[PDB]
Design a protein around this nucleic acid. Structure first.
Ligand SMILES: [Mg+2]
Ligand SMILES: [Mg+2]
Ligand SMILES: [Mg+2]
Lengths: 227, 157, 49, 94, 97, 48, 227
DNA sequence: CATCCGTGACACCAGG
């Protein structure tokens, strides 16, 4: 009467969205599996985020730039939404360079391209420069995990660099449904469906695999008892 | 209070039955609620007190865990050797007190089991615990009541 | 000590009429009084916190 | 709650005599570097550091546990004050 | 909810349990479908809510909604204060305030 | 200085509901809607 | 930003084959409950045990009848049978019927059950019933393997017309309590400390039960492999 | 043995 390995279905939409189904699972195992995976997905999935910004003729965060409509606070708030995917596994830091002038709405595309680095949200607005307004930025993206505020890392590559709050996690949302299902004559079985929305840096399936690996590694910790 | 209150339902509404299996089958048909007051053969009871009879607190709370019954259903439980008609929640509260004071007989003497716990009854509990066990054990009792009251108020809805 | 700064809410080339907003002051969202945030609240106890 | 506070309140005729006794004993332990303790090595109160367990530096915790052992004598007019001072300085130097 | 019904998901098991509890509370009419009872709760301003620590639902439906909340000028950053020793007053030789 | 909200800062709404922030939980501990949307603030009903 | 995570020390604190405390610290923020809740669900729902599932007592029609010559009613006997801790020494065995025939002035214990090959009654001193001069007790109880908890009216298994179904208390675990406390490692501030507390009936030990739980959970983690 | 009058006193912390 022991229930055996269930079918595992995968539905995807681009690098952004993913549904992952397991059925049939024993009663109550829908939650038992879904909830810890959701916690690990929301809390411990590594990723990328901007961690520092230098702007020429800008000494600190509470500044304006002539010709630029946005103040530096809004520029850093915009850069906080920049999704930066690294292709090389062993890469840790990238320094994006942006140089712009004249009347233009500087977007995320305008960053000079670097090898093995893709910008996943290129339409992201950065600034609204007018005639004669010049913007010269060097932003720094690091690999990391979780949420690390600027007050804790203080990352500055040059003297007048502005540390930035970093939301490293690439997971934007995690839900999971537990629906009723049957196998043969057994009733009250669980059908688990994890819905995962990411930013594109890592895909829902990669995030699910990393979370599963983290949970298995944590279960490893009960292996060596001690009186 | 939320865990120590008992449900009172209106479906059965005081039907009379001869044999308890008649009441069980009636409730199974959907004609009597689990906590509706009924009278089987002459004594006042409910379907819940017959359908579910637990040998000890641990079994009752295991059934509560598995969703068989809720903490506010009136059930039959065997605690302290007596056959009690009470909810699993009141058993759980008695156990909270007993574990806190590390004295099962005194803890059973202190609590009013057959009443929902509220400000006055909990105050009398704290005072009697003081008189009977000392301030160290009463302080541990207070911290236990704090922990479980907060826990159960969170998920109560 | 609270910061009193104005921020431009128009853009180059925009036609504006008399009395139209040009810059939001402190605690102002598009000319509306903005004294706080619209947060998503749940009304429930939480473990005594 | 202080461990065994009900018993300590049982040991005295006034709750404030317990405090006087405990504070005097704690000062006695502090002056003599705890060398006059009536606690066995296993009864020593311990403090968890980063490295490992160490002796609790709180002379009052010590004094209360010592009182709990029963190995202490308290009362009025037991010994002249300077006699006690000099005898404790002889048995336990500073 | 029609969004979810179109995305290929039915009513959840925990939602069914919360609906049972709400039926006990007299908040929804006994006999209607899950969607009807969830709509009745929603009209009362209440929704099903999941405990993030366990994945189990709050045993009852909870009031959830958008509220305007301000941060008042009384921030602990300005008020936390402590002192071992410090300046004393001229005549009284007591600590300043 | 750029002051973020911290434990001990005072919030209030427009109806006289005032309270000091006593706890900042990580998102995964917050009560969430079935579609995975966590709530922002948890107000105690006993205040009403 | 840069993090270092010392592997957590696992600590066991047992008292016989009935109870144990299990401490796992330090854990990254949140993983205390992430580990505790699934393990608790598993320990309460899926640890294999045994349980009395049906009882036939001669000349007894229904469950709420009285018995001549015995002081207890049938309900009390069924409760005592619910408390019977039976252990199966052979992994292939799945069901046994236990015979018990006694009379005269005597207090039946769990010893009086006739021994069956590879069925160890862990608690032979468990009281069952007292009989008087002229009291007769002929009963057969049905002991099945299973997991969790199944009410009598959910299996309803009847070998004959007057076999009373008994709520099957399968689970060897009687209670699982766990509690997470904040802990620090140097200047890491919000680390978690997990403390498990497992009560069993002796058939399986708390440490055995926890290991079976973590094994079940890892095996379920393996179910995300083959789309 | 009354009325009139002058003189006391009128919460705490915080910041001011
Ligand atoms: Mg029954
Ligand atoms: Mg009593
Ligand atoms: Mg913590």
């Amino acid at each position: 009467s022991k229930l055996k390995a269930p079918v595992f279905t995968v539905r995807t939409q681009g690098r952004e969205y993913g549904e992952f189904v397991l059925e049939p699972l024993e009663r109550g195992f829908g939650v038992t599996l879904g909830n810890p995976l959701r916690r690990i997905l929301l809390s411990s999935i590594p990723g990328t985020a901007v961690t520092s910004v230098y702007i020429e003729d800008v000494l600190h965060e509470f500044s304006t730039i002539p010709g630029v409509k946005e103040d530096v606070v809004e520029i850093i708030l915009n850069l906080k939404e920049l999704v930066v995917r690294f292709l090389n596994p062993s890469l840790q830091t990238v320094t994006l360079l942006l140089k712009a002038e004249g009347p233009k709405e500087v977007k995320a595309r305008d960053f000079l391209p670097v090898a093995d680095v893709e910008i996943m949200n290129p339409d992201l607005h950065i600034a609204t420069l007018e005639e004669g307004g010049r913007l010269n930025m060097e932003v720094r993206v690091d690999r990391g995990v979780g949420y690390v505020p600027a007050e804790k890392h203080g990352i500055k590559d040059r003297i007048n660099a502005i540390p930035v709050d970093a939301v490293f996690s690439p997971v934007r949302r995690v839900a999971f449904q537990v629906e009723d299902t049957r196998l043969g004559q057994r009733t009250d079985l669980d059908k688990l469906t994890l819905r995962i929305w990411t930013d594109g840096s890592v895909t829902p399936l990669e995030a699910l695999n990393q979370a599963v690996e983290i949970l298995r590694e944590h279960l490893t910790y009960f292996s060596n008892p001690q009186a | 209070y939320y865990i120590t209150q008992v449900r009172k339902e209106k479906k059965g509404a005081g039907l009379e039955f001869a044999t308890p299996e008649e009441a069980l089958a009636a409730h199974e048909r959907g004609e009597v609620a689990l906590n509706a007051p009924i009278k089987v053969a002459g004594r006042e009871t409910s379907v819940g007190r017959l359908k579910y009879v637990f040998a000890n607190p641990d079994e009752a709370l295991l059934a509560v865990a598995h969703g068989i019954v809720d903490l506010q259903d009136v059930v039959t439980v065997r605690y302290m050797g007596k056959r009690l008609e009470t909810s699993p929640g009141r058993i759980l509260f008695a156990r909270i007190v007993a574990e806190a004071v590390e004295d099962e007989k005194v803890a059973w003497e202190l609590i009013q089991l057959d009443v929902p716990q509220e400000k006055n009854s909990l105050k009398d509990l704290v005072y009697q615990a003081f008189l009977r066990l000392g301030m160290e054990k009463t302080a541990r009792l207070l911290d236990a009541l704090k922990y479980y009251g907060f826990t159960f108020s969170t998920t109560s809805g | 000590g609270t910061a009193l700064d104005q921020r431009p809410r128009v853009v180059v080339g925009q036609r504006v009429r008399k009395g139209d907003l040009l810059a939001d002051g402190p605690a102002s969202e598009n000319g509306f009084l903005a004294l706080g945030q619209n947060v998503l609240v749940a009304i429930m106890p939480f473990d005594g916190y | 709650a202080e461990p065994g506070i009900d018993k300590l309140f049982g040991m005295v005729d006034s709750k404030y005599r317990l405090t006087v006794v405990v504070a005097k004993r704690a000062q006695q332990l502090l002056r003599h570097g705890f060398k006059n303790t009536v606690l066995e090595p296993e009864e020593r109160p311990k403090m968890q550091t980063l490295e490992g367990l160490f002796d609790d530096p709180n002379a009052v915790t010590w004094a209360m546990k010592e009182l709990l052992t029963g190995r202490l004598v308290f009362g009025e007019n037991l010994v002249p004050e300077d006699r006690l001072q000099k005898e404790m300085e002889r048995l336990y130097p500073v | 909810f029609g969004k979810r019904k179109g995305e290929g998901f039915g009513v959840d098991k925990r939602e069914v349990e919360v609906l049972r509890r709400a039926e006990k509370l007299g908040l929804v009419t006994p006999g209607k479908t899950p969607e009807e009872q969830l709509k009745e709760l929603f009209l009362q301003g209440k929704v099903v809510l999941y405990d993030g620590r366990t994945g189990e639902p709050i045993e009852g439906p909870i009031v959830v909604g958008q509220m305007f909340i301000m941060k008042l000028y009384h921030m602990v950053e300005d008020k936390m204060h402590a002192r071992s020793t410090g300046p004393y007053s001229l005549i009284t030789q007591q600590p300043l305030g | 200085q750029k002051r973020k909200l911290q434990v001990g800062d005072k919030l209030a709404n427009r109806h006289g509901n005032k309270g000091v922030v006593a706890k900042i939980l990580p998102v995964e501990d917050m009560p969430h809607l079935p579609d995975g949307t966590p709530v922002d603030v948890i107000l105690n009903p006993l205040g009403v």
